[PDB]
């Protein structure tokens, strides 16, 4: 199986095969540690942000990949952005402070 850009799950925006063009490989906790033992921060950021969970960063990346500019404008992963609303859905006020 191989996938470049396929469909995405509705509940959480994540790679999911809808065409039988299979969703990408699942990057787990152990693989994160494997990246953590190496000094690779950007590989890890792109792994859990632009390549998967960021509904913005993914398209902003794709346009850069065809334009010839290798960069990432990561933003915040939609999983954590959803987790904020679930916490905030309770009586818990969770804010991002300072600047």
């Amino acid at each position: 199986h191989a996938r470049s850009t396929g469909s995405y799950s509705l509940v959480t925006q994540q790679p999911l095969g809808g065409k039988a063009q299979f969703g990408g490989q699942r990057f787990g906790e152990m693989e994160v540690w494997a990246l953590e033992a190496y000094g690779a921060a950007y590989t890890l950021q792109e792994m859990l942000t632009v390549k998967s969970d960021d509904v913005n960063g993914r398209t902003k990346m794709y346009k850069n990949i065809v334009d010839g500019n290798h960069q990432m404008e990561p933003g915040m992963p939609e999983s954590f952005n959803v987790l904020l609303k679930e916490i905030r859905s309770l009586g818990i006020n969770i804010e991002l402070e300072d600047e």
Binding site: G39, G68, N69, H70
Partner: protein, 89 residues
């Protein structure tokens, strides 16, 4: 290809700061602002920067120096353009 980065790791000790410096330079080449400092074999910017590190003509000091110079090279051009903004008064 570049099989081992060992020579670059000698030039800058950390080996993590190597990735950073080589990154910054690789974008200077990839986004077209500059050209290679050493013969390009069809090697992509990733490796061209590493060759530039191995030959010791590119690192964090040099880049910051080069960038710091370009600020005044551009500040010289716009000298009249921005001083014409005396309209602020």
């Amino acid at each position: 290809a570049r099989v081992t980065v060992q020579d670059a790791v000698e030039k800058i000790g950390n080996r993590f700061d190597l990735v950073l410096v080589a990154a910054r330079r690789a974008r200077q080449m990839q986004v077209g602002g500059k050209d290679p400092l050493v013969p390009e074999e069809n090697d992509k910017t990733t490796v061209i920067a590493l060759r530039e590190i191995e030959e010791g003509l590119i690192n964090n000091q040099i880049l910051d120096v080069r960038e710091r110079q370009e600020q005044q090279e551009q500040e010289a051009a716009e000298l009249q353009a921005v001083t014409a903004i005396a309209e602020g008064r």
